[PDB]
Design a binder for these strands. Structure first.
Ligand SMILES: Cc1cnc(N)c2[nH]cnc12
Length: 231
DNA sequence: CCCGAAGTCCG
DNA sequence: CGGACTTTCGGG
């Protein structure tokens, strides 16, 4: 069975505009976990738009197929384009897609893909269906996979006043002893972000609960101005 | 335009 | 450890 023609067309068009000179630093930035074609986001977006204009966006019946086929291509720009394409099918994504999104998180995993899946696609799903959080979050925290652990921390990133504080702090408590940078930093990020909504609660939490030094420092990067730094 | 959100390099 | 500094991206 041949590659979906939309994916084949995207692959041809991206490859025709590859930049090996830019690809080397782009790959280094991701610690050489991936090959790159060397195409940065503004051009990558336009090349995708070109193919949509010529071929049209595929029927929704092929949405998951398109994403998987792009996920399986070696160069990282194809996963970035896959995420761009998933946004175009946003109105068709629902709670039944959580396992599909899980599988994207744990394949070709790095912060650039995971941080574009979790606070947006998964965040929106669990905002609408909070009763499903406990069907996934405990497993993610218990898993050996640091990207599922990061997903548990960051899916509420953008919730603002809809933040479940008890849940957030319970999740952070479960993961606060992790020595993994991407967990310590995720804890720092979600606390820093939620502090924009409720600084008093974040300040009290970080002053009175154990956190990795990196997590605490990132959490209070801004709000330490509001409370001061005691001698 | 601005500002706020991984990486290297150094003490 | 944390500060200083870097480019790239998204949002205002
Ligand atoms: C995630 C992140 C944070 N801070 C910066 N100054 C960055 N530059 C590029 N990505 C960045």
């Amino acid at each position: 069975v041949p590659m979906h023609p939309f994916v084949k067309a995207l692959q041809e068009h991206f490859t025709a505009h590859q930049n090996p000179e830019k690809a080397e630093p782009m790959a280094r930035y991701m610690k050489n976990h991936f090959l790159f074609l060397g195409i940065q986001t503004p051009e990558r977006r336009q090349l995708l738009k070109d193919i949509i204009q010529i071929h049209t966006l595929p029927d929704q019946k092929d949405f998951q197929i398109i994403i998987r086929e792009l996920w399986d291509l070696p160069e990282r720009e194809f996963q970035a384009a896959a995420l761009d394409i998933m946004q175009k099918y946003k109105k068709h994504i629902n709670e039944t897609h959580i396992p599909f999104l899980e599988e994207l998180i744990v394949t070709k995993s790095w912060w650039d893909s995971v941080d574009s899946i979790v606070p947006t696609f998964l965040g929106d799903i669990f905002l609408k269906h909070p009763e499903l959080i406990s069907a996934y979050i405990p497993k993610w925290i218990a898993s050996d996979n640091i990207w599922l652990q990061r997903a548990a921390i960051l899916f509420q990133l953008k919730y603002k006043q809809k933040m479940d504080e008890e849940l957030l702090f319970w999740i952070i408590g479960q993961l606060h002893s992790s020595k993994e940078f991407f967990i310590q930093k995720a804890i720092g990020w979600v606390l820093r972000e939620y502090a924009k909504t409720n600084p008093d609660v974040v300040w009290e939490y970080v002053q009175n609960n154990e956190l990795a030094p990196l997590s605490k420092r990132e959490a209070i990067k801004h709000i330490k101005q509001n409370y001061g730094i005691n001698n």
